């Protein structure tokens, strides 16, 4: 695949890039999951109930 | 190395050598075992042997002539040697064996006798010549289902199925003027030969062309001929090398000179300035090894061969060797490159500046068939000196670093680990 | 072959304890290793049995040790064996290490053996620290406090590491409970490390008092050394028994008989005797960071000996200058301990600083200088020109 | 420390009348205090052998001296294990305390040094 | 049969399209696995490490 070769030119991915990619992934994935999860439960969350019933 | 060449239908090539005492004249065809197929494989070897048959040799002996024939992958040769003056008798013989006695050599009595001999030849080789047998299988697997895969001596199966017709079929398709170069080495002059040839005329199947086929390809693979009854383990391993006349032809040969060849039993061999020797001599990992950079028309093989009685430490032998190769990409030293330059020159010298004319004939013929001319040693030495560490690293990063390999071996090879383990050693881990 | 050699399990016992080829001349100093094995076993066995009646909660810790002392049948024997046992463990480890220093045991090809040993020393000290904390007396609280704070010297993340170790705002309930959990763990890691120690010892075998090859005259471990070790096993037990039943508290501190108090650090605070020299080293540096570094370096410098000893022969047996300085070092080590037991006062402070320098100079200066001089002395004292 | 280095410094002192009159006596004293001769060993018997240079040297040592070395070593371990010394008439005398292995050691050291230099030579084109 | 005649491997051998097809796919898979394992290990280590930080019941600032 040329999409792979443009970045790694026939070499495997080195640890440095692996660890570096893990750090980025860890944050991007958390945001994506939390948003989906919270959106899926829109209405049930405390935040949602706190806005409406302003107590 | 005087480059003298002339064309008038037939392409004549000579190389005068003041100090010689003898002369060699013959014809070199641009076809070899690679121009054969799985079924007529061994046909060229067959032609070589009928040309050297007792009958056709007794004739040449009375005339004071010696017969020579060499079957390679990209070419074939038939050479006649004689004194510096009898150069004309030589031509009369070539003119005879390929125009006159063409039928006498293919008689039922002669063919059957020759076929029976090469049959016994090839069998003894497959039964006893383990290092060459293995090197042959390296080609067989590395280039499987491609031209360069066919052994030069041919196989037993195809050999015993060959008939007189096959020789002719091959001969009509390959022993042609357009796929030939008449060679003359020793002390004979260019004009002296060109006139002796121009004396006779005719043609006999002229204006034709050799057949075409499929392009040679390297396939990462292996073939294992395990035989526990043999005393050693013989193995050859290599990556796709450089085809003759390639930008990295010399860099590849230099690279192979760095790791060189070794013979555990010879004192001086044990002292060579080769890093790898520090690692293999402690536990005596092998009896010998030899690196090579084989070059052909379409491809090549770069690697090494080795023999060992150390059947329990073969993995260390292979590990240290491939580990050294990794170095060519990331850390080959300046002085390793310089030592190789010197030693490479010396070897090319011993090859091309051999005292023997038959060798020069084969070298001359083969070279002009490909690049039209023979490579001058002085130009080779300049290219070799021009090589730098960067050149070497660039070459290894392309041909060596993390590339597929071809493996072949016979004997006590239980200790030779799986393909993937060997394959993993083609590179090193890093950050 | 014999079942002891062919069986998968027995062959291990056979190679290490039965047919193991020992240098015919190893003296009693080579009995310290078997003694350390006994100590570890004693410590583990007594600890487990006490563990059955102990409570790590900071409010029940001290009283549960009192419960073991008063209500548990033979409980006071378990505790005194454990407590005094820890002390003997260090006295024997100090002798084992000193034996190593004197006979060049650290020299090639036994460098790994020595390094793993340094690992064991560190784990053993940490284990002892953790165990002492579990009693939760005055010394326990403040010791936990001072030692965990050692890490606050690490720049930037320093204070977070300490809060993480404590599990709170100060040494408290979560600190004692994890410390007891950890105290239970490490002895098993040490054992694992001991096995590695023995594996390194085994490929090269023991050295000997002469410092030369033992290959020409070996005698089997079984009988000769199995019985020679028994001699020291019994003397070790006899002396430990003297302390356990007749003077069970002379090696400890009375302050640890007072429940820990977070608001009061006793003026009579003093670390456990075996930690005193390192305590003195740290106390000699008028800088927080440099102080902890130097103290930790005091242990790590043991790793440089294989490289600072330039002698062409292993061991001090035939070396007058090396023998003299070896004892300077030993006695300097005891003085460092005595300094540690004193207050931060005029004569003592300078003495500690001077003794601290002597401690490091031995490994970094004296050993390499003296060994080089002795090499030449042995040469010119015989060769003619 | 290499014996080449020890010898270099030692020879220098041994050739200098001033240093030689000052050091040698102290060295003689040192060797007598060392006490290895009372165990029946020669100094060269004390050299730690677990390294390639010494293994090379001990390999090259002639058969007869090798058997002699073995005896002195075995006899020493035995004497040491009994906590005694050998009777005076068995002590190695100064005349006998000869550097028999030293020449083999220096030879082995020089060969390794050259091999190390040759393994790392630079080239000037 | 001659050992020189390699048996048929056509059923698994890819054609002369892109030689690095197997390579690129192989290296991407291993890279992604390595990438995800690292994130997993990091979060596993952080899960245990944090279990030692001050508990909810002791964070009370009186
Ligand atoms: C506070 C916590 C302490 C815990 C540690 C307890 C264990 C202590 C170990 C002692 C030790 O390692 O000392 C070793 C030195 C070296 O000694 P060596 O050169 O090898 O011995 C030659 C033998 O006489 C051979 O003689 P033997 O025939 O084997 O009998 C020896 C002697 C051994 O006694 C022992 O228990 C050894 C200490 O038995 C007796 O005659 C004693 C009768 C009452 O022995 C000495 O010189 C002792 C002075 C330091
Ligand atoms: C972190 C680093 C820690 C290291 C610190 C060191 C540990 C502290 C020291 C504790 C005790 C260790 C004493 C020294 C270790 C034993 C020394 C040794 O091995 O001595 C051997 C020696 C005589 O043996 P030879 O084999 O050399 O005799 C020649 C025969 N031809 O035997 C002798 O010369 C006699 C032995 C005399 C021992 C007196 C020791 C004094 C110790 C003070 C006790 C501490 C209590 C307060
Ligand atoms: C739990 C603690 C330890 C155990 C069980 C242990 C056990 C042993 C044993 C059984 C031996 C062989 C007999 C002997 O020489 O006593 C030995 C040898 C040795 N140990 Fe340890 N050891 C421990 C800690 C250490 C430490 C802390 C060091 C070093 C800092 C050390 C250094 C050595 C050395 C150098 C030898 C080889 C001595 C020689 O043969 O000259 N050991 N040990
Ligand atoms: C290398 C082994 C060990 C060492 C050096 C060690 C050391 C110590 C020390 C110094 C103390 C405080 C002694 C005091 O003044 O009372 C202690 C206490 C304690 N240890 Fe250990 N210990 C070891 C192994 C064990 C094991 C394996 C356990 C757990 C099963 C254990 C359980 C305890 C308990 C229950 C206490 C509290 C009771 C007491 O004060 O003795 N110990 N330990
Ligand atoms: C972790 C290490 C802790 C301890 C290390 C000490 C090593 C010594 C172990 C002693 C085992 C002796 C067995 C002798 C044997 O099997 O030979 C038997 C003879 O056994 C006997 O005569 C028994 C004598 C009483 C042994 C004393 C028990 C020791 C007390 C244990 C304390 C150790 C904690 C072979 O005898 P034979 O050779 O004459 O035919
Ligand atoms: C107590 C035992 C429980 C677990 C047993 C399971 C055994 C699996 C161990 C995995 C180690 C892989 C090492 C491979 C290696 O070094 O090859 C290296 C290559 O390593 C890689 O490519 C990275 C692989 C990253 C994924 C590893 C899985 C992460 C660990 C997950 C948690 C497992 C408990 C050699 O590669 P080369 O063949 O090209 O020369
Ligand atoms: C921290 C541990 C580190 C690990 C090192 C392990 C070393 C073990 C030291 C203790 C050895 C003592 C027990 C060995 C038992 C010898 C008898 C034996 O192996 O008989 C075995 C059968 O054993 C069993 O069925 C049960 C063994 C359970 C062991 C429980 C501890 C006979 O085995 P055998 O060698 O004869 O096999 C012949 C080939 N068919
Ligand atoms: C070494 C013992 C731990 C083994 C647990 C494996 C059983 C599967 C459940 C894992 C849950 C624990 C972590 C968690 O909740 O994180 C969750 C993510 O878990 C994963 O990705 C788990 C994949 C496992 C990869 C681990 C490879 C091995 C780790 C070795 C460390 C040296 C949540 O992450 P987070 O806190 O949001 O950052
Ligand atoms: C969870 C595990 C943890 C946190 C492990 C930590 C391990 C730390 C070190 O072991 C490797 C450490 C024990 C070791 O340092 C190298 C010792 C020599 C420390 C010596 C030591 O003791 C003291 C002591 O005992 C006290 O008692 C009341 C009081 C003390 O000051 C007043 C000290 C003290 O000032 C020092 C330096
Ligand atoms: C215990 C739990 C911990 C899990 C942590 C996960 C660790 C992941 C490590 C991942 C990759 O580590 C990385 O691997 C690749 C091979 O895959 C290595 O690549 C090496 O082999 C490849 C494959 O032949 C070569 O192409 C390459 O040139 C070579 O450098 C790379 O140099 C290394 O840096």
Domain segments of chain D: what residues? 1-125
Separation between Cα atoms, residue C61 and residue C64, nearest integer Å: 5
Question: Which residues of C are less than 8 Å from E58 in CB distance?
Answer: 167-169, 172-174
B103-121 burial, b at 16+ Cβ within 10 Å, e below that, comes to eebbeeebbeebbeebbee
Binding-site residues on chain E for chain A (CB distance < 8 A): 18, 20-21, 23-25, 27-28, 30-31, 34-36, 38-39, 42-43
E6-18 burial, b at 16+ Cβ within 10 Å, e below that, comes to beeeeeeeeeeee
Structure tokens at A36: 């989906």
- Minimum distance, in Å, between the CA of residue B240 and any CA atom of chain A: 16
> Are B431 and A10 inside 8 Å of each other by CB?
no
Q: How many beta carbons lie within 10 A of that of residue C205, not counting itself?
A: 16
A1-55 domain in CATH 1.10.4190.10?
A: no
Q: Does B150 touch chain E (CB under 8 A)?
A: yes
> Are E54 and C168 inside 8 Å of each other by CB?
yes
**Ligand 6 centroid distance, CA of B238 (Å):** 28
Separation between Cα atoms, residue B415 and residue C273, nearest integer Å: 58
Q: Say if strands B11-16 and B4-7 run parallel, antiparallel, or are unpaired.
A: antiparallel
> Are C172 and E54 inside 8 Å of each other by CB?
no
Q: What is the DSSP letter of D89?
A: G
Q: Would you say the C-alpha torsion C109, C113, C119, C125 has a positive or negative sign?
A: negative
- Name the region of C211 (left: φ>0; alpha: ψ -120 to 50; beta: rest): left
Structure tokens at C338: 């005595």
Separation between Cα atoms, residue A35 and residue D61, nearest integer Å: 81
| Helix intervals (H) in E1-61 | 21-50
Contact D77, C25 (CB under 8 A): yes
Q: What is D1-125's CATH number, 3.40.50.261, 3.10.20.880, 1.10.1090.10, 3.50.50.60?
A: 1.10.1090.10
CATH code of the domain in which E29 resides: 1.20.5.270
Strand boundaries in B21-132, DSSP class E: 23-29, 66-71, 76-82
Instruction: Judge whether E61 lies within some domain.
Output: no
The torsion angle over the Cα atoms of residues B372, B374, B380 and B383, rounded to 10 degrees, is -10
**Which H helix or E strand runs over B183?**
strand B180-186
- Angstrom CA distances, D65 to B60, D42, D59, D97, stand at 70, 12, 11, 13
Place of tokens 């022993």: B175
Structure tokens at A16: 């440095």
Strand order in the sheet with B23-29: B4-7, B11-16, B180-186, B23-29, B76-82, B66-71
From the list B273, B334, B338, the residue facing D118 with the nearest CB is: B273
Q: What value does the CA radius of gyration of chain B take, rounded to a whole number of Å?
A: 23
Place of tokens 């029940």: C60
Structure tokens at B195: 């006139």
- Angstrom CA distances, C215 to B357, C19, C70, stand at 64, 15, 55
Catalogue all structural domains in chain C, each as residue range(s) with its CATH number.
Answer: 1-385 (1.20.810.10)
> Are A14 and B431 inside 8 Å of each other by CB?
yes
Strand partners, B68: B79
Contact B237, B405 (CB under 8 A): yes
Separation between Cα atoms, residue B25 and residue B85, nearest integer Å: 12
Q: Among the options C5, C59, C202, C268, which is catalytic? A: C202
What residues contact residue B74 under an 8 Å CB cut-off, 6+ apart?
B30, B31, B32, B34, B244, B296, B297, B366, B369, B370
Q: Among the options C64, C105, C152, C229, which is catalytic? A: C229
User: Does the C-beta of E36 come closer than 6 Å to ligand 8?
Assistant: no
The torsion angle over the Cα atoms of residues A34, A39, A45 and A50, rounded to 10 degrees, is 110
Q: Among the options C64, C140, C206, C371, which is catalytic? A: C206
- Minimum distance, in Å, between the CA of residue A22 and any CA atom of chain E: 5
Name the CATH architecture for the domain at B209-431. 2-Layer Sandwich (3.30)
Separation between Cα atoms, residue B78 and residue B92, nearest integer Å: 14
Separation between Cα atoms, residue C124 and residue C242, nearest integer Å: 24
E47: Cα separation from own chain's centroid = 21
Which residue CA neighbors atom 29 of ligand 2 most closely? Answer: C317
| DSSP reduced 3-state for C79 | helix
Report the candidate in C283, C44, C263, C288 with the shortest Cα–Cα distance to residue C155. C288
Structure tokens at B162: 């060959």
**Ligand 1 centroid distance, CA of C28 (Å):** 6
Whether C141 is a known active-site residue: answer no
Contact C93, C37 (CB under 8 A): no
Name the CATH architecture for the domain at B1-202. 2-Layer Sandwich (3.30)
Q: Is B381 exposed, middle or buried (0-12, 13-18, 19+ CB in 10 A)?
A: middle
Structure tokens at C201: 């010892």
What residues contact residue C101 under an 8 Å CB cut-off, 6+ apart?
C305, C326, C329
Domains in chain A: boundaries: 1-55
Omega before C240 within 30 of 0, i.e. cis = no
Instruction: Judge whether E60 lies within some domain.
Output: no
Contact C100, C117 (CB under 8 A): yes
Whether C140 is a known active-site residue: answer no
Q: Among the options C56, C87, C99, C272, which is catalytic? A: C272
Place of tokens 């004396």: B199
Report the candidate in C101, C99, C110, C93 with the shortest Cα–Cα distance to residue C362. C101
Structure tokens at B45: 């070897």
**Ligand 9 centroid distance, CA of C272 (Å):** 9
- Angstrom CA distances, C2 to C22, C219, C223, C348, stand at 21, 19, 18, 63
Separation between Cα atoms, residue B90 and residue B26, nearest integer Å: 8
**Which H helix or E strand runs over B184?**
strand B180-186
Contact C92, C121 (CB under 8 A): no
DSSP notation for B269-310: HHTSS-THHHHHHTTT--SEEEEEEEE-SS-EEEEEEEEES-
Q: What is the DSSP letter of B266?
A: S
Question: Which residues of A are less than 8 Å from E25 in CB distance?
Answer: 1
| DSSP reduced 3-state for B244 | coil
The torsion angle over the Cα atoms of residues D39, D40, D44 and D49, rounded to 10 degrees, is -60
Which residue CA neighbors atom 15 of ligand 7 most closely? Answer: C9
Whether C228 is a known active-site residue: answer yes
Structure tokens at D26: 């102290």
DSSP notation for C328-379: HHHHHHHHHHHHHTS-S-HHHHHHHHHHHHHHHHIIIIIHHHHHHHHHHHHH
- Minimum distance, in Å, between the CA of residue B217 and any CA atom of chain E: 10
Structure tokens at E11: 């059923």
Regarding chains C and E, contact by 3 or more CB pairs under 8 A is answered as: yes
Q: Among the options C99, C141, C228, C253, which is catalytic? A: C228
> Are E3 and B225 inside 8 Å of each other by CB?
yes
C11: Cα separation from own chain's centroid = 31
Q: What is the DSSP letter of B233?
A: E
Q: Would you say the C-alpha torsion B153, B159, B164, B170 has a positive or negative sign?
A: negative
Q: Is C237 exposed, middle or buried (0-12, 13-18, 19+ CB in 10 A)?
A: middle
Separation between Cα atoms, residue C106 and residue C101, nearest integer Å: 7
**Ligand 6 centroid distance, CA of E37 (Å):** 10
Report the candidate in C313, C333, C102 with the shortest Cα–Cα distance to residue C212. C313
Report the candidate in B291, B304, B152, B296 with the shortest Cα–Cα distance to residue B218. B296
Q: Does C178 touch chain E (CB under 8 A)?
A: yes
Separation between Cα atoms, residue B149 and residue B142, nearest integer Å: 7
What residues contact residue B233 under an 8 Å CB cut-off, 6+ apart?
B307, B308, B309, B311, B314, B409, B410, B411, B412, B413, B415, B416
Separation between Cα atoms, residue B419 and residue B409, nearest integer Å: 12
- Angstrom CA distances, B109 to B56, B60, B106, B165, E3, stand at 13, 19, 8, 15, 31
- Angstrom CA distances, C377 to B339, D11, D67, stand at 45, 12, 27
> Are C313 and D47 inside 8 Å of each other by CB?
yes
Instruction: Judge whether E45 lies within some domain.
Output: yes
Report the candidate in E19, E16, E6, E3 with the shortest Cα–Cα distance to residue B141. E6
Strand partners, B294: B301
Which residue CA neighbors atom 6 of ligand 3 most closely? Answer: C33
| DSSP reduced 3-state for C273 | helix
**How many domains would you assign to chain E?**
1
CA-angle at E33, arms to E28 and E37, nearest 5°: 150
Provide long-range contacts, Cβ within 8 A and 24+ apart, for E22-27. E23/A10, E24/A1, E24/A4, E24/A5, E25/A1, E27/A4, E27/A8, E27/A11, E27/A12, E27/A13
- Minimum distance, in Å, between the CA of residue A55 and any CA atom of chain B: 55
Please compute, for residue B208, the number of CA atoms within 13 A of its CA located in the half-sphere on the CB side. Answer: 15
The chain B residue lying nearest A10, using CA atoms, is B402
Whether C229 is a known active-site residue: answer yes
Q: Is B229 exposed, middle or buried (0-12, 13-18, 19+ CB in 10 A)?
A: exposed
Regarding chains C and A, contact by 3 or more CB pairs under 8 A is answered as: no
Instruction: Judge whether E12 lies within some domain.
Output: yes
Resolution of the experimental structure, in angstroms: 2.5
Chains that touch B (3 or more CB pairs under 8 A): A, D, E
The torsion angle over the Cα atoms of residues B145, B148, B149 and B153, rounded to 10 degrees, is 140
Separation between Cα atoms, residue B365 and residue B357, nearest integer Å: 12
Contact B195, B165 (CB under 8 A): no
Binding residues of C are 16, 82, 96, 183, 197, 202
Structure tokens at C234: 């019994």
- Name the region of C103 (left: φ>0; alpha: ψ -120 to 50; beta: rest): alpha
> Are B137 and E6 inside 8 Å of each other by CB?
no
| Helix intervals (H) in chain C | 3-6, 10-13, 32-51, 61-70, 75-102, 111-133, 138-148, 158-166, 173-204, 226-246, 276-283, 288-300, 305-308, 320-340, 346-361, 367-380
The chain D residue lying nearest B273, using CA atoms, is D119
**Which H helix or E strand runs over B239?**
strand B233-240
What residues contact residue C371 under an 8 Å CB cut-off, 6+ apart?
C309, C310, C311, C322, D1
Contact C43, C85 (CB under 8 A): yes
Contact B243, B313 (CB under 8 A): no
Separation between Cα atoms, residue B94 and residue B91, nearest integer Å: 5
Contact C370, D1 (CB under 8 A): no
Separation between Cα atoms, residue B231 and residue B309, nearest integer Å: 7
Strand partners, B235: B306, B409
Structure tokens at C364: 């970094």
- Minimum distance, in Å, between the CA of residue B415 and any CA atom of chain D: 29
User: Does the C-beta of C13 come closer than 6 Å to ligand 7?
Assistant: yes
Question: Which residues of E are less than 8 Å from A11 in CB distance?
Answer: 27
Angle, in degrees to the nearest 10, between helices B87-97 and B54-62: 150
What residues contact residue C12 under an 8 Å CB cut-off, 6+ apart?
none
Structure tokens at B396: 């290894």
Binding-site residues on chain A for chain B (CB distance < 8 A): 10-12, 14-16
Report the candidate in C253, C241, C207, C267 with the shortest Cα–Cα distance to residue C27. C207
The torsion angle over the Cα atoms of residues C12, C13, C17 and C22, rounded to 10 degrees, is -20
Structural domain including E2 reads: 1-55
DSSP notation for C16-73: IIIS-EEETT--GGGGHHHHHHHHHHHHHHHHHHHHTT---STTTHHHHHHHHHHTST
Which residue CA neighbors atom 3 of ligand 8 most closely? Answer: E44
Domains in chain B: boundaries: 1-202, 209-431
Contact C311, C104 (CB under 8 A): yes
Mutate to test the pocket of ligand 1, among C28, C29, C230 (most ligand atoms within 8 A of CB): C28
| DSSP reduced 3-state for B152 | coil
Q: What is the DSSP letter of E15?
A: P
């Amino acid at each position: 695949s040329s999409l792979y070769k443009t970045f790694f030119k026939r070499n495997a991915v080195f640890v440095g890039t692996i660890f570096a990619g893990a750090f980025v992934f860890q944050t991007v994935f958390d945001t994506a999951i939390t948003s989906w999860y919270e959106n899926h439960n829109k209405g049930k969350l405390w935040k949602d109930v706190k806005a409406r019933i302003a107590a | 190395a005087e480059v003298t060449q002339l064309s008038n239908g037939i392409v004549v090539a000579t190389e005068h050598n003041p100090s010689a005492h003898t002369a060699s004249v013959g014809v070199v065809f641009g076809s070899g075992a690679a121009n054969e197929n799985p079924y007529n494989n061994g046909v060229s070897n067959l032609w070589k042997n009928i040309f050297l048959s007792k009958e056709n040799s007794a004739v040449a002996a009375k005339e004071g002539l010696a017969l020579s024939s060499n079957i390679s992958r990209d070419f074939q040769s038939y050479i006649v040697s004689s004194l510096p003056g009898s150069t004309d008798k030589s031509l009369d013989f070539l003119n005879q064996s390929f125009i006159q006695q063409k039928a006498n050599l293919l008689s039922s009595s002669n063919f059957e006798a020759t076929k029976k001999s090469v049959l016994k030849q090839v069998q003894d080789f497959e039964d006893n010549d383990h290092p060459n047998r293995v090197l042959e299988h390296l080609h067989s697997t590395a280039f499987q289902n491609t031209p360069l895969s066919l052994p030069t001596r041919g196989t037993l199966e195809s050999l015993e199925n060959l008939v007189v017709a096959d020789l002719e079929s091959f001969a009509n398709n390959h022993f042609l003027n357009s796929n030939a170069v008449v060679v003359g080495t020793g002390n004979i002059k260019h004009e002296d030969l060109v006139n002796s040839i121009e004396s006779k005329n005719l043609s006999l199947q002229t204006g034709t062309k050799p057949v075409l086929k499929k392009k040679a390809a390297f396939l990462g693979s292996e073939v294992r001929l395990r035989d526990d009854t043999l005393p050693k383990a013989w193995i050859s391993l290599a990556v796709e090398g450089e085809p003759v006349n390639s930008p990295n032809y010399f860099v590849a040969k230099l690279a192979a000179q760095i790791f060189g060849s070794y013979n555990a039993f010879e004192p001086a061999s044990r002292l060579q300035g080769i890093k790898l020797l520090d690692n293999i001599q402690e536990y005596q990992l092998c009896d010998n090894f030899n690196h090579f950079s084989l070059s052909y028309k379409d491809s090549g093989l770069w690697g090494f061969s080795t023999a060992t009685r150390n059947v329990t430490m073969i993995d260390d032998l292979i590990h240290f060797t491939l580990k050294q190769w990794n170095r060519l990409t990331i850390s080959v030293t300046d002085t390793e490159v310089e030592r190789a330059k010197s030693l490479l020159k010396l070897q090319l010298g011993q090859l091309y500046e051999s005292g023997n004319p038959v060798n020069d004939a084969n070298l001359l013929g083969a070279e002009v068939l490909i690049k039209g001319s023979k490579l001058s040693l002085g130009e080779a030495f300049k290219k070799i000196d021009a090589i730098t560490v960067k050149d070497v690293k660039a070459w290894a990063g392309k041909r060596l670093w993390d590339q597929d390999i071809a493996i072949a071996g016979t004997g006590q090879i239980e200790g030779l680990l799986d393909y993937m383990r060997i394959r993993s050693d083609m590179s090193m881990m890093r950050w | 072959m014999a079942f002891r050699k062919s069986n998968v399990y027995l062959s291990l016992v056979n190679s290490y304890i039965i047919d193991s080829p020992q240098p015919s001349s190893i003296n009693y100093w080579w009995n310290m290793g078997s003694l350390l094995g006994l100590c570890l076993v004693i410590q583990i066995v007594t600890g487990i049995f006490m563990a059955m009646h102990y409570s790590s909660n900071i409010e029940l810790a001290f009283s549960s040790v009192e419960h073991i002392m008063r209500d548990v049948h033979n409980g006071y024997i378990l505790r005194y064996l454990h407590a005094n046992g820890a002390s003997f463990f260090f006295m024997v480890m100090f002798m084992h290490m000193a034996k190593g220093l004197y006979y060049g045991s650290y020299r090639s090809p036994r460098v790994t053996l020595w390094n793993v040993g340094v690992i064991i020393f560190i784990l053993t000290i940490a284990t002892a620290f953790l165990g002492y904390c579990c009693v939760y007396g005055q010394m326990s609280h403040w010791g936990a406090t001072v030692i965990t704070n050692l890490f606050s010297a690490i720049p930037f993340v320093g204070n977070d590491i300490v809060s993480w170790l404590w599990g709170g705002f100060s040494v408290s309930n979560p600190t004692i409970q994890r410390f007891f959990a950890l105290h239970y763990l490490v002895p098993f890691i040490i054992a694992a490390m001991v096995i590695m120690h023995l594996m390194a010892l085994h490929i090269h075998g023991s050295s000997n008092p002469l410092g030369i090859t033992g290959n020409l005259d070996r005698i089997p471990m079984h009988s000769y050394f199995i019985f020679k070790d028994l001699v020291t096993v019994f003397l070790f037990m006899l002396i430990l028994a003297l302390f356990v039943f007749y003077s069970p508290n002379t090696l400890g501190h009375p302050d640890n008989y007072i429940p820990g108090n977070p608001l009061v650090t006793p003026a009579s605070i003093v670390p456990e005797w075996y930690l005193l020299p390192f305590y003195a080293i740290l106390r000699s540096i008028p800088d927080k960071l440099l102080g902890v570094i130097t103290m930790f370096a005091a242990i790590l410098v043991l790793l440089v000996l294989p490289f600072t000893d330039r002698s062409v022969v292993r061991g001090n047996t035939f070396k007058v200058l090396s023998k003299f300085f070896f004892f300077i070092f030993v006695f300097n080590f005891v003085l460092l301990g005595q300094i540690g037991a004193c207050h931060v006062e005029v004569p003592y402070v300078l003495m500690g600083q001077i003794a601290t320098f002597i401690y490091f100079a031995y490994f970094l200066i004296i050993v390499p200088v003296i060994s080089t001089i002795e090499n030449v002395l042995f040469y010119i004292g015989r060769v003619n020109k | 420390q290499s014996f080449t280095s020890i010898a270099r410094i030692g020879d220098y002192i041994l050739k200098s009348p001033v240093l030689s009159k000052l050091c040698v006596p102290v060295a003689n004293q040192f060797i007598n205090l060392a006490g290895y001769k009372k165990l029946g060993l020669k100094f060269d018997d004390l050299i730690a052998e677990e390294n390639p240079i010494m293994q090379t040297a001990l390999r090259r040592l002639p058969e007869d001296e090798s058997y002699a070395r073995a005896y002195r070593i075995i006899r020493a371990h035995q004497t040491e294990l009994t906590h005694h010394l050998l009777p005076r008439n068995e002590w190695i005398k100064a005349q006998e305390d000869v550097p028999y292995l030293l020449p083999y050691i220096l030879e082995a050291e020089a060969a390794a040094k050259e091999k190390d230099e040759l393994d790392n030579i630079e080239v000037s084109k | 049969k001659s050992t020189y005649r390699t048996p048929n491997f056509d059923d698994v051998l890819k054609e002369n399209n892109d030689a690095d097809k197997g390579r690129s796919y192989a290296y991407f898979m291993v890279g992604a696995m390595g990438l995800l394992s690292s994130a997993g290990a990091k979060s596993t280590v952080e899960t245990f490490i944090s279990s030692m930080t001050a508990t909810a019941d002791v964070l009370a600032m009186a």
